[PDB]
Amino acid sequence: VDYDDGIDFPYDDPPLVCCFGAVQKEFVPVVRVHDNPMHPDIYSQWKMLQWDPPEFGRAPGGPPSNVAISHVRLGGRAAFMGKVGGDDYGEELVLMMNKERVQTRGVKFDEGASTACTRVKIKFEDGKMKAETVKEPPEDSLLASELNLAVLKE
Amino acid sequence: GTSTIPGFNQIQFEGFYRFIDQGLIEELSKFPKIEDIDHEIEFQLFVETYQLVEPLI
């Protein structure tokens, strides 16, 4: 927008990569309808859908923090840009990424929010239940003024 | 047994259930009606009302 940020540096190899978004534990985003359900209670049968999967679930993706962790284990260097709350679950997510040697200087804490918690209101429009968002979680509330430009430069 | 190792005692467990659930009738229905030489007195078993009582001990 205006200028740079940080001090220019020889920038160690391998080159850094930045992953932007929400840091979540598991959480498969791609959800569609499958026509071959197992028993609703006996989850010991559910592994049979892991070896005969729905086509959309043959190689599922996940949150961007998964890519950052996987990239580091493959020998790269990665930094995560995002926001977590100041609660205990937020620390656990950051400690998970620090253990995997992912840079977390781009991670901002929101001390007034609960990590991975969205406030929603339940309504009954046209005889059907729906929900609408009242307050977004800290994971989806990173502001532009909170971006770490040293990471984006490197 | 389709997606886990089955219980190691399953063969014994299913077999005993089949004996109680179906095995008793097949043998209790092969019991002949008993008639004497003179055919005066006849003894029979009403198998449809067979019962099993839980052990007292």
Side-chain angles (χ1 to χ4, degrees):
Chain A
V1 194
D2 55 344
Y3 274 146
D4 79 328
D5 181 320
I7 299 316
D8 208 294
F9 193 79
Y11 282 164
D12 37 40
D13 278 354
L16 185 70
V17 177
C18 178
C19 290
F20 180 93
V23 47
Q24 301 152 308
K25 188 174 320 265
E26 271 47 74
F27 194 66
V28 194
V30 176
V31 178
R32 305 186 86 181
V33 175
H34 196 220
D35 57 333
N36 182 31
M38 295 287 108
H39 194 277
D41 305 326
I42 312 170
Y43 46 75
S44 77
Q45 302 179 2
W46 298 0
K47 67 171 67 69
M48 294 194 283
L49 292 177
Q50 284 310 312
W51 65 57
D52 196 19
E55 269 314 311
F56 63 85
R58 174 150 254 119
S65 54
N66 272 14
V67 173
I69 290 164
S70 180
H71 183 81
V72 173
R73 280 199 192 170
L74 288 166
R77 297 190 311 118
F80 183 76
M81 215 159 276
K83 180 186 289 184
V84 299
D87 59 327
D88 282 6
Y89 188 51
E91 271 73 88
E92 206 215 77
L93 295 178
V94 177
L95 182 56
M96 155 198 99
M97 277 186 306
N98 280 333
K99 171 64 132 52
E100 304 293 337
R101 288 176 10 256
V102 175
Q103 300 185 7
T104 37
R105 49 168 175 170
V107 179
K108 154 152 226 291
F109 288 86
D110 203 318
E111 310 296 334
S114 305
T115 310
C117 288
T118 314
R119 305 233 146 211
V120 292
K121 212 196 81 60
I122 303 180
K123 80 188 29 172
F124 289 101
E125 157 215 347
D126 73 279
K128 298 194 308 178
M129 224 174 279
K130 305 183 191 305
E132 105 292 336
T133 304
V134 163
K135 184 188 178 181
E136 279 191 332
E139 278 103 323
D140 300 73
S141 291
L142 192 70
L143 292 181
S145 68
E146 310 165 329
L147 294 169
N148 187 292
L149 292 185
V151 171
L152 292 182
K153 178 172 171 58
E154 181 178 357
Chain B
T2 38
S3 61
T4 71
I5 293 170
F8 293 137
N9 283 120
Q10 219 52 43
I11 286 190
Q12 311 291 99
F13 186 100
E14 305 319 11
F16 188 73
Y17 187 73
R18 186 193 326 291
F19 170 65
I20 298 305
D21 175 55
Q22 301 152 267
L24 297 172
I25 310 329
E26 265 254 5
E27 299 299 336
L28 269 182
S29 299
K30 284 159 186 129
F31 192 86
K33 271 185 287 322
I34 301 181
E35 293 184 2
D36 50 321
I37 306 178
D38 319 331
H39 302 265
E40 309 181 357
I41 299 182
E42 179 182 2
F43 192 75
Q44 68 161 342
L45 285 171
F46 297 114
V47 193
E48 294 186 359
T49 158
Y50 72 112
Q51 192 204 129
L52 281 179
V53 184
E54 69 184 29
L56 313 183
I57 60 183

